[PDB]
């Protein structure tokens, strides 16, 4: 971080600070706290967990001298997002990508939890009303599906409303459409990575929400780029 700050202040330029894994800072101070003479706080952590973290985090920042874009990997002990450490980390971030076990297990990578991940920039004033509406609808669609999954294990599909069947059917597509091969990940995918431009993503999902691709097989949204790629994959599977 000290290195990073120096570029920000005396290089007058956009620095990129990558940290894997910031959890390990809180863990480390934790491992010495008893031998430092401290009474332990909850869940075994140090009494200074939070102020420790402010001192570090409040330095990782954009100032008026220069800009820092930081990306911090944050381990989550035993998947429990409420463990003091990640739980104190949330409020230092402008954007939180929350990865999920239930998603990884569905074979969806990156396993980003589409509902639990947030951004200060998801705001009409910033992204445009259209972009915002698309994201909002995508989220309602997935939530409705997450909601209904309780039924879809006890009553199956058949007792579902026409409107809701359509939603659930659209939801399962959208859910898979949010996956992407990574270039760094080819080894675990055997699939050449893809990058997808923002304007395409919005257009692509907007189009799906309107139903202009309800005729298209499910497997055709899985692990591809933008809506072009999906229309290609559908033809190959049709042959």
């Amino acid at each position: 971080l000290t290195i990073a700050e120096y570029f920000r202040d005396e290089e007058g330029q956009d620095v990129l600070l990558f940290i894997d894994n910031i959890f390990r800072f809180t863990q480390a101070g934790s491992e010495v706290s008893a031998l430092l003479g401290r009474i332990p706080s909850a869940v075994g952590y140090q009494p200074t967990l939070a102020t420790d973290m402010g001192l570090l985090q409040e330095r990782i920042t954009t100032t008026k001298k220069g800009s820092v874009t930081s990306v911090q990997a944050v381990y989550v002990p035993a998947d429990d997002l409420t463990d003091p450490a990640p739980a104190t980390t949330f409020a230092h971030l402008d954007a939180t990508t929350v990865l999920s076990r239930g998603i990884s297990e569905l074979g969806i990578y990156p396993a980003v939890d589409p509902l639990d991940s947030k951004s200060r920039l998801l705001d009409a004033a910033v992204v445009g009303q259209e972009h915002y509406d698309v994201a909002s609808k995508v989220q309602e669609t997935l939530q409705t599906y997450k909601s209904l999954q309780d039924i879809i294990a006890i009553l199956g599909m058949d007792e579902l409303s026409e409107q809701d069947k359509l939603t659930v059917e659209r939801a399962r597509k959208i859910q898979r459409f949010l996956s992407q091969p990574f270039a760094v990940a080819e080894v675990f995918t055997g699939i050449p990575g893809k990058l997808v431009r923002l304007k395409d993503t919005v257009a692509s999902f907007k189009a799906v929400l309107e139903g202009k691709y309800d005729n298209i097989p499910e497997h055709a949204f899985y692990m591809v780029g933008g809506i072009e790629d999906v229309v290609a994959k559908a033809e190959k599977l049709a042959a």
Partner: peptide, 13 residues
């Protein structure tokens, strides 16, 4: 095998 157990779940009801 995951797609299998995804289904060995739907076979239950």
């Amino acid at each position: 095998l995951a797609q299998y157990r995804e289904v060995a779940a739907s076979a239950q009801f």
